[PDB]
């Protein structure tokens, strides 16, 4: 009776997956982690600690952000003591927040939060950020109050202001003021603070906030933006880089003035544009084209086919799990279902058949 | 959102509706259909005032009776409530039919929250407001004024203009609350007191305490200018046979009787002085009473009685004042004597308990005053006071304390008793002797009400058994039913701590009240559910000197220390403008997020009109069994008075009050159904009393949450956290809990 | 406040600060002003963001807290004192700030006068403890008592504002001023001791609620509506998300800077399938050899480029003497720096900008001089034995710079010319 079960929860779980959007999503994001280190995540309760499993996570989040999104800066402040401490800029080198958590990892979380001070100086970093970049902020909490040396209001008033959203993933329930930061900053919506139930759950949420996030109509910031592709050289000779100047092999070469870097996608230090490659841009493109739905056909109805088209495998038989592309007309088996709506971006029946 | 009951167009301010609410207005529409009244118990954490409201505007208009409405509560807060409610609705009115229709509307209050003359405002006894608003508006000051400008009495100029303007005049139609009423007359200059004073006649529904409905005192007034054939509703009076026993009870102290002696001597002097100088007014005011004119007789409407009227109207005396009392020095002689046998009866050495026949016989007995001056008491002295013009009244409160309880004593013979005891604090340094009056009945100020009006509801949230009332109260209704909670999904988790986290009981008695381990039991889940709560948490003992013997100690152990670093403490303080500042302070901290607790007492001033929802309602702490004081001589009177009246269990009744002092106190978590909240029992003997408990209560009362301890309770109400923390879909309600127009024609077509 | 880009070049105290800071920030700032002589306000106008960050590192500052219940009593006892606590003391007590600044300076020392702070009465007083006349306290600091009692009251007179009547309780009690009932239970009403005084327990728990209302007027700080108040969100419409969608038109252009027919293909293709359903010979696939030699030739030839592609596969090791390989880096680097200016100003374009692009220009011929005149120094310091690598190394910085002075005259021989 298991399979029973098994699809009313597979039905209640596409009731909301029902409705798939092409809304326009911001690509050239501005994400923010800030970490509390206090004595609310030295609690063991998760095993190993709240402390240990943030870590990891945050090395997961850091590594899917930068392979999904490649077109933004990363930047890092932890809160610990009283205190928000910047340990990361934001910066194109995931590596170098990268080695900052690792310098975390060993260091002891301890003290008490303060959202005030920590969302005061994560706004002073956002404050020199170009029009384009989406500001937003993750915020990781485990306590249930704030000790805050003034207003949370002002200050909300300010990111309002200022166009920045906030996710909040709180760790033991909800807290009030943290509810009213994401109505207040999310136009009303509560769809931003989230509360895990186990560390699989932790493990979606952030999955989930890899996702970029759709923007709003009357927040219009329509525009253009200047792109320049450099170009890699291979050289005998080691050169001076020009940002960590230093003798280096290859490297890329400005295409505007003639430099040369050590990595992409940056932008120039010297005639300050940034510089990409084609693959970067196209990487979102699952996302700027998104995927419909496969829809099972009924196991009473009768059937186009009886094996899988895609990877050629039969299908089994109570009901049946051909999922079908209306796209394109075909039925699919679920692991090829899942790998074409998630791992591929294309469906191969919608590519051989002509349009 | 409108649609039609069967004869009535009904509008809703909001799209969506409750079943529940939709079968409240049902009832409701019956019992106004059939006369009389009924009684109906509803889950209060869906909306109830609005729909009653509503119900009630759509009666009066579609009606052709036009009805007037009769409202009352117990605070200010609900008054407020209900004031800012009707604003609402009656502006959705407004906007949905495209036009204002005629309305009036308005509360009604004392001066202390009223009188907006400013040196008047600065006072705090609003005994003292009124008396100084008399003295400087009574009509006498401005009757002397106006022969004499150069007499420096003032007029309020607020009165002023309200004199200038007239009573239509006075407010444009419609509502308008304490505030906006704050800020018109801030405009207009006009006393906010003497315009609801003339708003009387005119109020298509009417708002004032139980205390104005009940006490004939401040209550004759409100029936001199009030339609017989209005409608009465009354909600969450399920404790006002207190207000009904204070409402006819008295006690007397040493130095009342101190300041009575003295005031009539001051009085019997200045009658000397006056009788020296000019007793003209003397022998006119001695001929007045020849005539036997009476208050209403001689007094104007702009003079108020001194005395104030005790009893109820119906059982006032309307003859002559005998000549024995007749004369000033007659009747100050009269008091002086009973001041003099009151002294001797001060003196006893014991309880001391007996009828009021048998007191007046051994009044009539010692003295040789008899039952009609005895009554005439308040009506002479007040009389005496008019002529007197005394008006330094300070000497004389306690002569209308003592002329008040003459009265009442020589006024009525069963369900009253006088208590007099050598001790006024019984573990004090010196005995202090006290007689205290009493009414053992407390329906007998519900059969002016009962008698006069009809159309009268009485309905609550947390009222159980519904039969219990008309046993204790001598009325009957037409209808007897309660309202189960058609939930769609569990949001509210009682639970019942039998047991600590040691698997030790606990509970509130008194003797067991200095015990460490329970200290330590408490403490402890007090610290566990402070480290958990994210917002907001109040905590309920049964007595003050419960709590300041058990937080001074657990000061001694410095768990408030611990309990700092996660969120404030708030106690309830003796004075309630303290106390106001501290529900401020809560209020803030809640709303910062940085999380607070509120400490206050079961009975306490917090628990009787003020909510906590959605941060301030998340748990609460309710402390044992509330349990009244057991050895009041007072209690067992009236046990046994209502136990030979009604034939009830004694202890069964104590249950019942408590039982539902502990109901008031946890109905303040859930205002709507989006709301949760965790409820706890932190005494071993609750457990026997699910079945006493009201019904939608306990049906979220599961029998594995029947005996529970500290540590299944905080594994609870953390995975009750974590429920409570995810959303839901719209389709599992949309049908069977929240109801769109649709839903409920759909369900008005599947009743048909 | 402190955030103009005017405030954060003013600040040459904290540029200092964060100067002090770093080391290679010497170095570079050395060798920009102290050596090149730029304009300091231009060296800082880059780093910006650099400065506003340690800025408001430095700028925050901690919430209150109950310093005195984080006080524990700890035989003997050994102070054990952290001066941020202690200037934390000094802040959420003034009281206790002025009985220190009375006394340390003047009478005795810190340690002892904690050591006597611990011991007062007034300490207890102020923490979570009731007074006893039992504990002698510290007389010089139990002085204070009525000092800090007058404080409490002015605090208090303070404290005090206007209520609400919503919520007033106040208004609730004074609903019927005319109550006439019966003494209420000593039980439920603040109990007294036998002598009628109090214990005092009102005292404690009024000044702890003191320190709430202290507390949360500290958060209220410098740094009608019952309408709203009284809203029941629960019935209203769900909020829905105004986000918008895109489509996208497609049309792309051909790629910018012979056709065969179907008869044709048809008749190959009936041939090819002849040729399939014929023969079909693994063995003939095997080459002449010859032709196999010249792909060999070719595959090799790929494999030799390839491979001296691959064989150039903390920097490079070098054999360069330390000295000039540090004076080399630097003078890249500086290079580099006023590169990154010149293009700053010339990208920004003003007529502002004019005589600081020329100026600039300037400073880009001495250092393509000064480069050249290093040339000269390894020239016969090597023998040009490696001083050809020590050219290359600084060579295409100097191409982008020289590039760049390129550019510079063609724009001006644009516009001027
Ligand atoms: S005249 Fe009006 S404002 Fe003045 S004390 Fe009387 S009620 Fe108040
Ligand atoms: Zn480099
Ligand atoms: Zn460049
Ligand atoms: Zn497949
Ligand atoms: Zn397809």
Not at chain 2, 236 to 239: D, L, P, V
Not at chain 2, 306 to 312: A, G, I, K, M, R
Not at chain 2, 498 to 503: A, E, L, M, N, R
């Given at each position: 009776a298991s399979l029973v079960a098994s699809i009313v929860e597979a039905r209640k779980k596409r009731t909301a997956k029902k409705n798939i959007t092409p809304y326009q999503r911001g690509i050239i994001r501005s994400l923010i982690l800030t970490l509390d280190c206090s004595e609310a995540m030295l609690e063991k309760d998760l095993r190993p600690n709240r402390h240990a499993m943030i870590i990891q996570y945050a090395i997961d989040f850091v590594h899917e952000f930068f392979d999904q999104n490649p077109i933004s800066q990363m930047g890092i402040i932890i809160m610990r003591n009283g205190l928000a401490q910047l340990?990361?800029?934001?910066?194109?080198?995931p590596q170098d927040h990268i080695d900052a958590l690792k310098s975390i990892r060993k260091q002891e979380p301890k003290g008490n939060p303060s959202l005030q001070n920590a969302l005061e100086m994560a706004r002073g970093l956002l404050l020199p950020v170009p029009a384009h970049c989406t500001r937003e902020v993750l915020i990781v909490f485990g306590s249930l109050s704030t000790t805050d040396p003034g207003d949370i209001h002002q200050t909300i008033d300010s990111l309002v202001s200022e166009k920045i959203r906030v996710k909040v993933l709180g760790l033991s329930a909800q807290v009030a003021i943290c509810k009213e930061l994401c109505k207040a900053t999310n136009y009303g919506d509560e769809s931003f603070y989230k509360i895990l139930l186990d560390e699989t759950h932790l493990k979606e949420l952030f999955n989930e906030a890899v996702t970029p996030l759709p923007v709003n109509k009357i927040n219009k910031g329509f525009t253009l933006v200047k792109m320049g592709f450099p170009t890699r050289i291979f050289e005998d000779t080691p050169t001076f880089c020009s940002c960590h100047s230093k003798l280096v092999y290859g490297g890329y070469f400005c295409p505007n003035c003639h430099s040369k870097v050590c990595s992409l996608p940056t932008v120039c230090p010297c005639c300050d544009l940034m510089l990409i490659l084609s693959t970067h841009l196209a990487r979102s493109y699952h996302h700027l084209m998104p995927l419909k739905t496969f829809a099972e056909v009924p196991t009473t109805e009768k059937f186009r086919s009886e094996d899988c088209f895609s990877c050629q495998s039969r299908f089994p038989i109570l009901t049946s799990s051909r999922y079908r592309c209306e796209d394109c007309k075909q039925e699919f088996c679920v692991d090829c279902d899942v790998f074409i709506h998630e791992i591929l971006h294309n469906c191969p029946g919608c590519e051989s058949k002509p349009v | 959102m409108k649609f039609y009951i069967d004869d009535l167009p009904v509008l809703f301010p909001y799209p969506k509706i409750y079943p529940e609410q939709y079968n409240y207005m049902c009832d409701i529409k019956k019992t106004l259909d059939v006369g009389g009244n009924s009684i109906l118990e509803m889950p209060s954490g869906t909306g109830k005032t609005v729909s009653l409201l509503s119900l009630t505007i759509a009666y009066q208009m579609h009606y052709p009776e036009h009805r007037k409405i009769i409202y009352c509560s117990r605070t200010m807060s609900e008054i407020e409530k209900a004031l800012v409610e009707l604003e609402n609705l009656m502006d959705y009115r407004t906007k949905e039919l495209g036009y204002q229709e005629d309305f009036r509307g308005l509360g009604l209050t004392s001066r202390k929250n009223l009188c907006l003359h400013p040196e008047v405002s600065k006072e705090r006894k609003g005994t003292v407001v009124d008396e100084k608003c008399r003295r400087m508006t009574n009509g006498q000051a401005k009757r002397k004024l106006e022969e004499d400008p150069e007499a420096n009495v003032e007029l309020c100029e607020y009165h002023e203009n309200l004199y200038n303007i007239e009573v239509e005049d006075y407010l444009p139609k419609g509502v308008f609350s304490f505030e906006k009423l704050l800020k018109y007359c801030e405009e207009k200059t006009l006393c906010p007191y003497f315009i609801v004073r003339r708003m009387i006649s005119l109020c298509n529904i009417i708002i004032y305490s139980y205390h104005y409905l009940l006490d004939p005192k401040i209550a004759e007034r409100v029936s001199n200018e009030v339609s017989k054939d209005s409608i009465v509703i009354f909600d969450?009076?399920?404790?006002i046979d207190n207000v009904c026993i204070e409402s006819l009870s008295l006690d007397l102290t040493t130095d009342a009787l101190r300041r009575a002696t003295r005031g009539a001597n001051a009085l019997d002097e200045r009658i000397s002085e006056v009788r020296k100088v000019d007793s003209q007014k003397l022998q006119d005011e001695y001929e007045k009473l020849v005539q036997g004119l009476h208050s209403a007789d001689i007094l104007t409407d702009q003079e108020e009685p001194?005395?104030?009227?005790?009893?109820?109207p119906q059982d006032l005396l309307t003859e002559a004042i005998p000549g024995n009392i007749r004369r000033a020095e007659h009747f100050v002689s009269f008091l002086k004597r009973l001041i003099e046998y009151l002294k001797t009866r001060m003196k006893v050495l014991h309880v001391i308990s007996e009828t009021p026949k048998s007191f007046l016989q051994h009044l009539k007995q010692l003295t040789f005053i008899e039952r009609k001056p005895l009554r005439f008491c308040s009506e002479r002295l007040s009389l005496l006071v008019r002529t007197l013009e005394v008006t330094e009244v300070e000497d004389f409160t306690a002569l209308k304390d003592i002329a008040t309880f003459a009265t009442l004593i020589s006024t009525y013979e069963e369900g009253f008793l006088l208590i007099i005891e050598p001790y006024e604090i019984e573990n004090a340094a010196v005995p202090n002797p006290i007689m205290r009056f009493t009414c053992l009945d407390a329906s007998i100020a519900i059969k002016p009400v009962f008698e006069r009006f009809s159309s009268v509801i009485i309905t609550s949230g947390t009222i159980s058994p519904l039969d219990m009332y008309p046993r204790m109260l001598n009325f009957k209704t037409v209808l007897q039913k309660s309202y189960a909670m058609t939930l769609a999904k569990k949001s509210f988790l009682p639970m019942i701590i039998?047991?600590?986290?040691?698997?030790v009981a606990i509970s509130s008695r008194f003797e067991i009240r200095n015990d460490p381990s329970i200290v330590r039991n408490y403490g402890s889940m007090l610290v566990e559910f402070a480290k958990i709560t994210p917002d907001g948490m109040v905590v309920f003992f049964p007595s003050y000197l419960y709590m300041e013997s058990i937080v001074s100690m657990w000061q001694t152990m410095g768990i408030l220390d611990e309990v700092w670093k996660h969120k404030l403490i708030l106690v309830e303080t003796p004075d309630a403008q303290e106390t106001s500042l501290a529900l401020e302070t809560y209020r803030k901290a809640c709303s910062n997020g940085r999380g607070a607790i509120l400490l206050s007492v079961a009975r306490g001033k917090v628990s009787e009109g003020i909510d906590f929802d959605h941060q301030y309602g998340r748990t609460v702490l309710m402390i044992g069994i509330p349990f009244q004081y057991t050895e009041s001589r007072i209690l067992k009177a009236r046990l046994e008075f209502m136990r030979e009246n009604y034939r009830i269990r004694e202890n069964d009744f104590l249950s019942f009050d408590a039982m539902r002092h502990a109901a008031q106190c946890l109905g303040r978590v859930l205002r709507g159904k989006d709301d949760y909240g965790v409820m706890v029992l932190a005494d071993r003997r609750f457990s026997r009393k699910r079945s006493q408990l009201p019904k939608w209560i306990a049906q979220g009362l599961s029998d594995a949450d029947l005996n529970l301890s500290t540590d299944m309770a905080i594994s609870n109400t953390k995975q009750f956290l974590r429920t409570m923390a995810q959303p839901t879909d719209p389709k599992d309600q949309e049908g069977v809990s929240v109801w769109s127009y649709e839903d409920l024609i759909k369900h008005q077509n599947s009743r048909k | 406040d402190s955030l103009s880009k005017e405030k954060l070049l003013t600040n040459l105290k904290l540029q200092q600060s964060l100067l002090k800071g770093n080391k290679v920030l010497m170095k570079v700032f050395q060798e920009t002003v102290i050596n090149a002589g730029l304009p300091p306000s231009e060296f800082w106008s880059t780093r910006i963001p650099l400065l506003r960050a340690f800025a408001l590192s430095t700028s925050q500052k901690v919430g209150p807290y109950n310093v005195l219940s984080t006080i524990k009593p700890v035989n003997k006892v050994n102070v054990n004192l952290s001066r941020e606590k202690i200037l934390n003391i000094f802040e959420n007590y003034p009281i206790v700030k002025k009985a220190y600044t009375d006394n340390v300076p003047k009478n005795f020392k810190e340690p002892e006068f904690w050591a006597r702070f611990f011991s007062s009465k007034l300490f207890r007083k102020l923490r979570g403890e009731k007074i006893m006349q039992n504990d002698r306290g510290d007389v010089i600091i139990d002085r204070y008592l009525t000092l800090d009692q007058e404080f409490d009251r002015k605090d208090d007179d303070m404290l005090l504002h206007p209520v609400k009547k919503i919520i007033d309780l106040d208004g609730n009690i004074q609903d019927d001023p005319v109550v006439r009932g019966n003494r209420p239970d000593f039980t439920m009403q603040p109990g007294v001791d036998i002598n009628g005084n109090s214990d005092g327990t009102v005292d404690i728990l009024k000044g702890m609620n003191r320190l709430s209302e202290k507390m949360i007027m500290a958060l209220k700080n410098e740094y009608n509506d019952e309408r709203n108040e009284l809203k029941i969100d629960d019935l209203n419409e769900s909020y829905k998300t105004n986000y918008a969608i895109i489509h996208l038109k497609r049309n792309a252009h051909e790629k910018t800077t012979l056709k065969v027919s179907n008869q044709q293909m048809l008749q190959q293709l009936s041939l090819v399938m002849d040729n399939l359903i014929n023969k079909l010979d693994l063995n003939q696939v095997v080459p002449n050899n010859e032709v196999s030699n010249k792909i060999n030739k070719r595959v090799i030839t790929a494999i030799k480029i390839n491979a001296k592609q691959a064989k150039h596969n903390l920097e490079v090791k070098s054999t360069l003497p330390i000295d000039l390989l540090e004076s080399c880096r630097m003078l890249h680097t500086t290079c580099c720096e006023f590169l990154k200016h010149f293009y700053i100003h010339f990208q920004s374009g003003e007529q502002k900008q004019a005589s600081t692009v020329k100026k600039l220009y300037n400073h880009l011929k001495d250092c393509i001089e000064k480069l050249n005149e290093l040339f000269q120094d390894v020239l016969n310091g090597d023998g040009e034995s490696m001083s050809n690598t020590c050219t290359a190394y600084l060579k295409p910085v100097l191409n982008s710079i020289t590039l760049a002075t390129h550019k510079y005259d063609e724009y001006f021989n644009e516009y001027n010319n």
């Open positions: 340990v990361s800029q934001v910066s194109g080198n | 969450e009076a399920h404790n001194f005395v104030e009227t005790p009893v109820l039998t047991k600590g986290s040691d698997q | -």
